[PDB]
Design a binder for this molecule. Structure first.
Ligand SMILES: [Mg+2]
Ligand SMILES: [Mg+2]
Ligand SMILES: [Mg+2]
Ligand SMILES: [Mg+2]
Ligand SMILES: [Mg+2]
Ligand SMILES: [Mg+2]
Ligand SMILES: [Mg+2]
Ligand SMILES: [Mg+2]
Ligand SMILES: [Mg+2]
Ligand SMILES: [Mg+2]
Ligand SMILES: [Mg+2]
Ligand SMILES: [Mg+2]
Ligand SMILES: [Mg+2]
Ligand SMILES: [Mg+2]
Ligand SMILES: [Mg+2]
Ligand SMILES: [Mg+2]
Ligand SMILES: [Mg+2]
Ligand SMILES: [Mg+2]
Ligand SMILES: [Mg+2]
Ligand SMILES: [Mg+2]
Ligand SMILES: [Zn+2]
Lengths: 60, 51, 177, 78, 116, 136
RNA sequence: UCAUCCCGACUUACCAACCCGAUGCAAACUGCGAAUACCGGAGAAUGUUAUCACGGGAGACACACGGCGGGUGCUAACGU
RNA sequence: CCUAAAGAGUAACGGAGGAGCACGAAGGUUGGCUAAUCCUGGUCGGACAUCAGGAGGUUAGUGCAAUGGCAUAAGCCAGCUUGACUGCGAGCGUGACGGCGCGAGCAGGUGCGAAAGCAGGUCAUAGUGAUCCGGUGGUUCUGAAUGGAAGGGCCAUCGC
RNA sequence: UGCCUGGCGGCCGUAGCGCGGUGGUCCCACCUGACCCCAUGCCGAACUCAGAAGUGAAACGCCGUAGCGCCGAUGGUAGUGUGGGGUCUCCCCAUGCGAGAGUAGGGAACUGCCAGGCA
RNA sequence: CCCUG
RNA sequence: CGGCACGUAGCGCAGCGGUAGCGCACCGUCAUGGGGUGUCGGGGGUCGGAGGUUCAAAUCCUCUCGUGCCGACCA
């Protein structure tokens, strides 16, 4: 750490739409509104045929 | 070939000069060096002057 | 910092459990995390290097090296010592805050995200990864960017092998696929 | 026909001037060389073209020393 | 590694002093302790030695790796070198930067009587 | 016609051919043609001898050529005064001392190998002889 | 050759980088290395000081062959 | 560089290459650092641009040819500077000579370093030209009856 | 007096690599923090400072082990000075010197001063 | 400018 | 035999450390009943071959095999 060359850097609150709040030390200044966090991504949660469509299509 | 001779004359006013070579194509600015002057016995500013 | 607390409080003894070591500092640590961005078009325009350096300062919270060419290469029209990249190195609480930023913001924001490759290790336990669009990063805002840009990330650790490194990253729940 | 060769330089008179066991005066040249083929030991100076000279009177004496097996020239004072 | 790097740093000064043939005040610094030896120009025989591992220093000093440690061991090595009768030694930082503990050592020796 | 693919220098001193050769042992194969006299061998002589060996034996066994013409020989063209520069390179030789195993061969019956070596020796310009692999 | 968008699957009339094992060569190669030679010191004998310095006078600066080490030439020349 | 025969030297219209410069930093010191090449991983990026790790150990580098050097680096980076100083010089090498070169130390002043110390150019060896005749600046040293001056001398330097 | 550890040397591979094992009371190293002394062409990575919770993991030291590197005979061979000789491009004899390579074998260093811990 | 016999 | 001049698209020619250029020609469309001329719009080159330095070679060097020129004289 020098002085007076690094970009300006304070604590920031961020809020994800799944009801999540977290506490992140950053540079943009203003607080963050987040689309998706690690607690609600489909991959992270884990939530991520021809004969059957033929039978359901042309069932006899 | 392109380096040409210059004389560094003293600022002590005694008319004493060293002589060097300089590349004026690369560096148009003059040359000032604190070097020894034998008649005033002091290290004094020698500045560039033409031959 | 809270990731470091998570490390020191649970990850070390978990590593102890499944690896049956003799030392709590046989349990591996993260040696350094360095961020590179090769801006090789600086020979076309040195100013976009300055814009890119500002962007990498924005993500890093840290002034970057403007790194120059090691040896002149004919094919890319570069001379030795020509500034063609930007880099930072991150250590300590900066590891932990930036790693928190990554694992809790950036990888949810990857466009068409399906997890990271576990085969990205270099054979010595150190991990590397490539980000294509820095706009997934909230440290930079949308309409003030000039060009689409990417970067690459390396986490160098003291782990002696790839299974060691992937076990450590799975302890940090790094999204392998 | 014609030749592209035919050039040479004057020989530089290199080599050891004062061999092992000489009595030397101060400032006498021991070895003229290109580079430190022989290195300077005690009471021996290495002039700017790597010329080894005796800084003091005495008897000149060759050795091999060091971890890399280099030849050193010293002056054992009489 | 760091030990071989420090040896590589110190080698130039050590061979310069060995060619000049002056008595050497060599410092060695560890995170916990510091050691100082005044040794003969032959490079094989010590004259005096003083270190923070000695009881007669560690009993009155609190911690052995600080400026107070450096100043005390410099004072101590200074009077033992004077009573052995040297008065003239050349410093040997042994690859450590002339700063902090090594600087405090040299200042302690210089104020307590050695000239270098 | 054997020749090095590239060399450090285009011309070479005349030199001398003193001493006795090493490589005096059959190394790879079993049956060898070994020099007894002393002299040079032109790459053309090597090629002619090798052709005689291979087409006498009719492609059985295997042939090792234990010499290589590395030495360039100059010749000054005719009606040219002495001096005015070393002559141009003309052909390549191999300096062969006594006791040099010149040719070597394997996989062939003894009488056939002896006959093929007889044709080879007839093409060679120097004294040769037949040698047999010894276990030491 | 099979499939021929990425992919990919076969055989080599074959050619072969690195490394390993083994055999050579080098005036402009040396991880080795003589005999001689050369410098210096000590010692005995021998030599009409044979050694060095300074001064007077020159001549000579077209060499030849033979031995050994070589360049060049054709390891040709009573060649160079 | 070889020929050149293990001191020096040694010829040919013998065998191969270079120079007629460059640099006020590419010099002085102080402090720090270590290369080529290959493999693995990774966004554009591909065989080769940047990064990380590993092997390797100078196969790199040296302002420019080759040889001999160089890790204590002479190689790379940064800070501060002008010793690329002035008058000398024990002694020595090398030349037929003109000359050329190394040089501890002394006196004056300086730079770097906390100091010991180092510095009278660059890793060394090429990058050059006698003398005459003049030109420029300083120095009363001389100055054709005397005072000056011109001219001349000395020192610095310029023109093949 | 003995063992272990650190520093400085002697010596410069018989001493260096590799493989296996072993050590932390002390020492050493890793280490814990660093707004401060200082420092990073960014990073307390290095360097520096303030300490001593944990670890001998890495490092380092020690021990064993020839898979190597290394050393290395006796004799022989090559070469060569001097004198002679031949079938004289090259060799031989008398005599003096005598390699390099290789083989048997050796070899997992030895040692000085001071300081510290234990007995 | 030319227009296969 | 010795120099010295050049090997660039199918042809003729420029360019002689970082870029390959001009004309004729070929192709496609217009104009014509049709051809030519004309008009519009394109493309095309291991830079003779090989290997050396350099970050890089058409340009710098060496050799190479082609074609041209000038001398191969006193006896
Ligand atoms: Mg004459
Ligand atoms: Mg003559
Ligand atoms: Mg003669
Ligand atoms: Mg004759
Ligand atoms: Mg010689
Ligand atoms: Mg000789
Ligand atoms: Mg002579
Ligand atoms: Mg240094
Ligand atoms: Mg330098
Ligand atoms: Mg330099
Ligand atoms: Mg130079
Ligand atoms: Mg007058
Ligand atoms: Mg008058
Ligand atoms: Mg005047
Ligand atoms: Mg630390
Ligand atoms: Mg261990
Ligand atoms: Mg031997
Ligand atoms: Mg061992
Ligand atoms: Mg017509
Ligand atoms: Mg006539
Ligand atoms: Zn969420």
């Amino acid at each position: 750490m020098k002085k007076d060359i690094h970009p300006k850097y304070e604590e920031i609150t961020a809020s994800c739409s799944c009801g999540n709040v977290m506490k992140i030390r950053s540079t943009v200044g203003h607080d963050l509104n987040l689309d998706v966090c690690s607690k609600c991504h489909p991959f992270f949660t884990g939530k991520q045929g021809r004969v059957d469509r033929f039978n359901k299509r042309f069932n006899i | 070939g392109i380096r040409e001779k210059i004389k560094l004359v003293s600022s002590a006013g005694t008319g004493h000069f060293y002589t060097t070579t300089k590349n004026k194509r690369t560096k148009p600015e003059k040359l000032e060096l604190k070097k020894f002057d034998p008649v005033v016995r002091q290290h004094v500013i020698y500045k560039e002057a033409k031959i | 910092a809270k990731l470091h607390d998570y490390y020191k409080d649970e990850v070390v003894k978990k590593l102890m459990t499944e690896f049956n070591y003799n030392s709590v500092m046989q349990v591996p640590r993260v040696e350094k995390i360095t961020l590179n961005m090769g801006v090789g078009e600086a020979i076309a325009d040195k100013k976009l290097l300055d814009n890119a350096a500002a962007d990498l300062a924005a993500i890093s919270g840290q002034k970057p090296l403007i790194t120059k060419a090691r040896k002149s290469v004919a094919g890319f029209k570069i001379r030795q010592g020509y500034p063609i990249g930007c880099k930072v190195t991150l250590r300590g609480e900066r590891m932990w805050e930036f790693f928190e930023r990554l694992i809790t913001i950036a990888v949810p924001r990857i466009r068409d995200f399906r997890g990271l490759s576990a085969k990205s290790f270099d054979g010595r336990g150190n991990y590397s990864m490539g980000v294509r669009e820095q706009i997934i990063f909230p440290e930079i805002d949308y309409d003030k960017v000039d060009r689409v840009r990417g970067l690459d990330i390396t986490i160098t650790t003291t782990a002696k092998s790839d299974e060691e490194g992937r076990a450590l990253l799975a302890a940090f729940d790094f999204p392998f696929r | 026909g014609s030749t592209r060769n035919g050039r040479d330089s004057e020989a530089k008179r290199l080599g050891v001037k004062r061999f092992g066991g000489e009595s030397v005066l101060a400032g006498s040249i021991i070895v003229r060389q290109r580079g430190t083929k022989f290195h300077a030991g005690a009471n021996v100076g290495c002039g700017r073209d790597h010329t080894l000279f005796a800084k003091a009177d005495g008897k000149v004496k060759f050795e091999v020393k060091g971890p890399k097996n280099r030849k050193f020239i010293s002056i054992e004072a009489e | 590694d760091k030990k071989s790097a420090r040896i590589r740093r110190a080698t130039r000064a050590r061979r310069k002093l060995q060619e000049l043939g002056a008595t050497r005040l060599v410092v060695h610094r560890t995170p916990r302790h510091i050691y100082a030896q005044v040794i003969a120009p032959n490079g094989s025989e010590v004259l005096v030695a003083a270190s923070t591992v000695e009881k007669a220093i560690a009993e009155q000093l609190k911690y052995t790796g600080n400026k107070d440690a450096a100043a005390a061991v410099g004072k101590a090595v200074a009077e033992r070198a004077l009573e052995k009768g040297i008065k003239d030694v050349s410093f040997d930082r042994s690859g450590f930067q002339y700063h902090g503990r090594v600087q405090a050592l040299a200042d302690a020796a210089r104020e307590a009587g050695l000239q270098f | 016609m054997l020749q090095p693919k590239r060399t450090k220098f285009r011309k070479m001193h005349k030199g001398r051919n003193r001493g006795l050769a090493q490589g005096t042992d059959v190394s790879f194969g079993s049956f060898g043609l070994k020099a007894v006299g002393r002299g040079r061998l032109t790459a053309r002589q090597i090629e002619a001898a090798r052709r005689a060996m291979t087409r006498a034996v009719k492609r059985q066994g295997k042939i090792w050529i234990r010499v290589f013409p590395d030495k360039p020989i100059t010749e000054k063209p005719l009606a040219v005064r002495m001096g005015k520069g070393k002559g141009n390179v003309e052909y390549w030789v191999a300096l062969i001392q006594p006791g040099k195993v010149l040719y070597e061969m394997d996989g062939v019956p003894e009488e056939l190998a002896r006959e093929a070596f007889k044709l080879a020796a007839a093409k060679l310009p120097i004294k040769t002889t037949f040698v047999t692999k010894t276990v030491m």
